[PDB]
């Protein structure tokens, strides 16, 4: 979702001129319109807490009750009070402060070869609860462009059209 | 009407012996692909109408069997095709789950080529429709699952020939 | 035709044809001179009856021809008018057969399976035949327009 339909060129201008911090840039990307259209409108209140804990706080959901406990902040205060409460936890301010971009904290053990399945792959933008509603299809009854003569594109075994660009090469040459 | 387990039990029973290591060796091979066949039969059930719409438009949609005089001209005759192609895509799904093509010749193949000759249905265009239908089925279920579902399509095409 | 199903009716009942059946085969063949004149009018008016038929069809259903419609582009629109030429032809058969038996087993039996399987809106093709009906009945007198229109609306009924 890094498209120039989703770039925020005025948030970027206020970061270059030292007006906002990175904590305000990270807040402005969650409250942005591309994030509400592509992510918030295809999750329920419980899976969206899992997305914003994994991407803002940098760590995984503890259990299925942490999802329940935080999803009522979105339903009663809206999305703007939920990201103020998340950014003002001491888990955030001890790790990233207001000047560091978040990251997935302690994903891989120092001597191992594998990791812990990075969080953009663990939770994509919609899941099983919205799969049976917005999933695409194959063979959609959609009336596409036609082809009209399919056996002339790939001939069969005794067809002399397989020897047609061989008469040009030999010629009287 | 036997699946892979029924065929394994029959051959092991027809000699009156128990299920030795070789009989269970194939049964374990069938249970390993049990997860693949259901998902293959899952998506085929979903895109049944879409697959048949793709095959006829890709193989015999605009050929002169579709035009007047061709074998598929009238709307009753055209409607019989997609009804007819539905069985091939459906019974092939059953063979893909059962892992044994016994159901095809039991319920599809016998008296089939002898029936199309009676009606005058072109067996040549029929097989190419199933071949094109086999080609789109490999699109949905993947490569190896398409290899499995494709293994029963040409079984129909072979016997129907 | 009226001759073939008045037979197969009395055929099934193990009997011959009644006066009610034979005074209508009689009444139909004396009607045969007037039927060929009516079908002769629609025969060499297919250029206007079809092209003006698809005239009102697109003005009333621009979705089917707009981008995304089933009959979009130079290609499908040609086939979009091809089917109207078919159904206009079957109405000429029904007028000469004195029944929709030719239209029944051609273009009507299982028609919803075809058009549903082609992605075509079956309601849209029904709108096309209605537009042809107003052009056809505008080409004939009142005594004839009660027939030529009469076979179209049967096709309208079975096509939905």
């Amino acid at each position: 979702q890094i498209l120039k339909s989703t770039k925020q060129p005025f948030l970027e201008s206020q970061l270059r001129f030292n007006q906002i911090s990175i904590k305000d840039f990270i807040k402005g990307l969650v409250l942005s319109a591309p994030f509400r259209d592509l992510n918030y409108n295809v999750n329920n209140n419980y899976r969206f807490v899992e997305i914003c804990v994994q991407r803002v706080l940098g760590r995984d959901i503890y259990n299925e009750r942490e999802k329940i406990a935080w999803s009522i902040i979105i339903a009663t205060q809206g999305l703007e009070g939920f990201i103020d409460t998340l950014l003002n936890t001491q888990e955030y301010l001890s790790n990233f402060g207001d000047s560091i971009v978040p990251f997935q904290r302690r994903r891989i053990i120092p001597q191992r070869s594998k990791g812990e399945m990075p969080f953009n792959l663990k939770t994509p933008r919609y899941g099983i609860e919205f799969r049976s509603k917005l999933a695409a299809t194959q063979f959609s009854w959609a009336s596409p462009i036609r082809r009209f003569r399919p056996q002339e594109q790939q001939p069969k075994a005794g067809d002399p059209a397989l020897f047609l660009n061989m008469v040009q090469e030999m010629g009287p040459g | 009407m036997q699946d892979a387990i029924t065929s394994v039990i029959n051959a092991a029973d027809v000699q009156g012996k128990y299920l030795d290591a070789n009989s269970v060796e194939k049964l374990r091979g069938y249970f390993q692909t049990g997860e693949l066949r259901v998902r293959a039969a899952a998506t085929i059930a979903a895109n049944a109408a879409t697959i048949i719409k793709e095959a006829v438009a890709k193989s015999l949609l605009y050929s002169d069997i579709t035009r007047p005089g061709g074998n598929m001209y009238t709307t009753r005759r055209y409607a019989a095709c997609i009804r007819d192609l539905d069985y091939y895509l459906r019974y092939a799904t059953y063979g893909m789950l059962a892992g044994d093509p016994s159901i095809l010749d039991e319920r599809v193949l016998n008296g089939l080529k002898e029936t199309y000759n009676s009606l005058g249905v072109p067996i040549g265009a029929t097989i190419q429709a199933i071949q094109a239908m086999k080609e789109v089925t490999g699109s949905l279920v993947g490569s190896d699952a398409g290899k499995e579902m494709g293994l029963y399509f040409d079984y129909i095409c072979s016997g129907l020939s | 035709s009226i001759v073939t199903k008045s037979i197969v009716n009395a055929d099934a009942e193990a009997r011959y044809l009644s006066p009610g059946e034979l005074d209508r085969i009689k009444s139909f063949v004396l009607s045969g001179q007037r039927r060929l004149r009516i079908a002769q009018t629609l025969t060499e008016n297919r250029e206007r009856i079809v092209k003006q038929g698809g005239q009102q069809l697109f003005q009333r259903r621009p979705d089917v021809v707009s981008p995304g419609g089933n009959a979009y582009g130079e290609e499908m629109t040609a086939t979009c008018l091809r089917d109207l030429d078919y159904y206009l032809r079957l109405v000429t058969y029904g007028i000469i057969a004195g029944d929709v038996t030719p239209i029944e087993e051609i273009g009507l039996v299982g028609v919803k399976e075809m058009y549903s399987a082609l992605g075509t809106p079956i309601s849209g093709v029904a709108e096309g035949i209605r537009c042809m009906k107003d052009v056809a009945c505008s080409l004939l007198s009142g005594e004839d327009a009660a027939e030529v229109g009469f076979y179209f609306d049967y096709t309208l009924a079975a096509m939905q």
């Binding site: 003569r149 399919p150 056996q151 002339e152 594109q153 001939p155 | 015999l60 050929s63 002169d64 069997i65 035009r67 005089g69 061709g70 074998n71 598929m72 001209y73 009238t74 009753r76 005759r77 009606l119 005058g120 072109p122 040549g124 265009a125 190419q128 | 058969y93 057969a97 038996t101 030719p102 029944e104 087993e105 051609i106």
Partner: peptide
């Protein structure tokens, strides 16, 4: 056997044969 029915001879149709260029 009906108002539309098939006979082999009236079939003028490259579909029993399959030269796909027509």
């Amino acid at each position: 056997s009906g108002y539309g029915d098939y006979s082999y001879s009236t079939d003028r149709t490259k579909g029993h044969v399959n030269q796909y260029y027509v």
